[PDB]
From Swiss-Prot:
Expressed at least in heart, kidney, liver, ovary and spleen, with highest levels in spleen and lowest in heart. Expressed on the surface of T-cells. The chain holds residues 715 to 825 of 828 of the full protein. Residues 1-102 form the BEN domain. The BEN domain 4 is necessary and sufficient for the localization of BEND3 to heterochromatic regions. Coiled coil: none annotated. Homooligomer, probably a homooctamer. Interacts with HDAC2 and HDAC3, but not HDAC1. Interacts with SALL4. Interacts with SMARCA5/SNF2H, BAZ2A/TIP5 and USP21. Interacts with the nucleosome remodeling and histone deacetylase (NuRD) repressor complex. Interacts (via BEN domains 1 and 3) with ERCC6L (via N-terminal TPR repeat); the interaction is direct. It does not alter association with heterochromatin, but is required for the repression of transcription. Transcriptional repressor which associates with the NoRC (nucleolar remodeling complex) complex and plays a key role in repressing rDNA transcription. The sumoylated form modulates the stability of the NoRC complex component BAZ2A/TIP5 by controlling its USP21-mediated deubiquitination. Binds to unmethylated major satellite DNA and is involved in the recruitment of the Polycomb repressive complex 2 (PRC2) to major satellites. Stimulates the ERCC6L translocase and ATPase activities. This is BEN domain-containing protein 3. It is found in: Nucleus; Nucleus, Nucleolus. It comes from the Eukaryota.
Amino acid sequence: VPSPYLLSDKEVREIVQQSLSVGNFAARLLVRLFPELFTAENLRLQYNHSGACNKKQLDPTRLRLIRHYVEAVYPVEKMEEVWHYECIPSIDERCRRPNRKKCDILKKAKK
DNA sequence: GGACCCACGCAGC
DNA sequence: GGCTGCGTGGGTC
């Protein structure tokens, strides 16, 4: 039974063409595969890839799918390190990214 | 209240 | 006293 989260070759290519780095590709796949976390409710703020820091854990099956697409597209010579040090931190940064930077909230507080 | 990306000091572990 | 994600801010678009 094929998964409904699967992306066509054309869809993957359109995401790759916008990706600045393999880490950014992982983050873009995260947004595409977890739409429920990227609504105006920002449920993403309650999740990270592992459940560390007393947060909820991203669906392990879709996290494996992100890694599958990363490994199907990008170089694999150092894939363990790319996943651990580039893709995982990019995924977590995308979940926790504030809609407004603290320095901008305070800079407007003068206006 | 721009959206977005990634580097990096830090606290908790 | 190293490793893991958070909070943060410089920077590009």
